[PDB]
Design a protein around this ligand. Sequence first.
Ligand SMILES: [Ca+2]
Ligand SMILES: [Cl-]
Length: 499
Amino acid sequence: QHNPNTRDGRTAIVHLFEWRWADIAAECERFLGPKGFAGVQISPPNEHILVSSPWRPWWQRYQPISYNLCSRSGGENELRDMITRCNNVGVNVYVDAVINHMCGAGGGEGTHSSCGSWFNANNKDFPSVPYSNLDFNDGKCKTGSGNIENYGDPYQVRDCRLVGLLDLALEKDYVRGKVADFMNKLIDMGVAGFRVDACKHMWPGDLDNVYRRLNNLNTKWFPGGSRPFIFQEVIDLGGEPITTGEYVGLGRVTEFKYGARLGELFRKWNGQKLSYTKNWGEGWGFMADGNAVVFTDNHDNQRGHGAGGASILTFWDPRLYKMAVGYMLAHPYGFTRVMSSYSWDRNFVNGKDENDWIGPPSNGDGSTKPVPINPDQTCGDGWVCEHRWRQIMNMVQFRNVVNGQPHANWWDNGNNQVAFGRGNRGFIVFNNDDWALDVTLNTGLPGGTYCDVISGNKDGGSCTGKQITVGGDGRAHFYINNSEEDPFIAIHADSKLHH
Ligand SMILES: [Ca+2]
Ligand SMILES: [Cl-]
C-alpha cells in the first residue's frame, strides 16, 4: 500500500482542488496525459452538507452526509466518466477520503446536502448511510465540550470532535464496514488510491482494519495484484505527542515538515539559508523517503493558518513559489504533489484572512464554474492553474526524465545560491541571493547545448529561451542575475540538442 501505482514512468500528481469532474476529465485528456502527470487528487466525492453561513465554503466538502457519490464537483455518472477518461490516458485518480467524521454537531436538519437527502445532525441521524446516535464517539470523549481541547492528549485527538465534527466510532465493525464499502465502490470504478483525510484523528488500529478490507485495483488498467495507494494526512512538526511514526507502516504519510521548512528557506527566515539544504530530506529529520508524500502547500495551509502558517509558500508569491516547487520536483526525496488552487479576495485582519472560507469560482447559487482555457494555455475565471505554468509543467517533465537518478554534484556559495544534479540526466541551479550568480560547475552531464526548461523549452532544433553549453568535461558556465524574474535554471537529457 505504499506503492503509488504510477504508469508510463510518470512521477507526480496534482491536486485539482475543487474542480468539477467534467473539467478534470477534459484536463486529463488535453493536458495531463500529454504532459506526463501521473495523476490527479480530487476533492471529496461523497455527499456533504451545504453551509449557507458563510456562503458555500470550500470546507463544507469535509462534512459528509452519506457515501452517495454526488458532490459539488458532480454526480455519480460524471464521476465514473472522469475516472474512465483519465485512466484511458494513463492518469491515475486519487480520492480525498473523509471518514473520521460526518458533519458538524450543530449542522441542524433538513435537506441542505449535496444530494438533497434529508438528515438530522441534531439526533445524529444519517438515514442515507445509514448511521445513528450509537455510531459515534461521544461516550469515549471526556472533554467538557466534547471537542478536542488539548493536543498534548493523544486520546482526545482520536475520540473527541475535531472542532465540533461528529466523530465516527471507528472501532465498530459496522462503521468500518460502511466506510470500506465506500472506498471499494470507488476502487471498483478504477480509482488508484486515497488521500485519507484527518488521520491524526483516527486510531491506526481502526485504519488498518479498513485498509485490509480494500480490494485490488481494477485490472482494466492496473496489473493484477495492485493495491490501493494510501497516503495519510498527519501533521507533525515536532513536539507533537503524535508522530507520523504511528501511521507510517500502514501506508505513506504527508511530510508537512517539508513545505514548512522549504518555505522559510526561500524566505530566508530565522537565518535559514539554501546552502543548508545539501542533506535535504532524511538528513533533515524528515521521515523515510519511501514513506513520504511531499508538497509545498495544500488547500489548508495555503490560507496561512495551517502547518507552517506564515512560512508556507503559495501562488500568491509566484517568484519564490516557482523556485520552491521547482526545487521539490528536482529533488529525489518523497512522492511529490503539486498544488492547483483558485484565487479569492484575501482580507487580512490581525493577520488572519477573514475570507479564507471562500469556495471556488462559482455562479451565485453556489454551483462551481467550469475551467476556461486561455489561448496561451493558462486558466481564466479565477482558477490559478499553477500546474500549467511553464516553470512547473517543465519541472514535472524534468522529474520524469531524471527519475531514479541519484542526487549528485552538489554545489553552494555558502549562502543562497546552490545547484545539484540527478545522475547524468539533469542539473538544476538556483540563485536566491541579492547578487548575481556567476560560475562554472560540473553538471555531471554529457557535453552539448541544453535548453533551459525554466525559461522555455526545446522546440525543433533550437531553444525558445536561455540555453547552456556543457563542455565535454561536463563543466558549464552559469549566469543568473538576481534581477531575473525566474532566478533559477534547469536542463536535462530531453532538453538537449542534436550534435
Ligand atoms: Ca476520530
Ligand atoms: Cl494533504
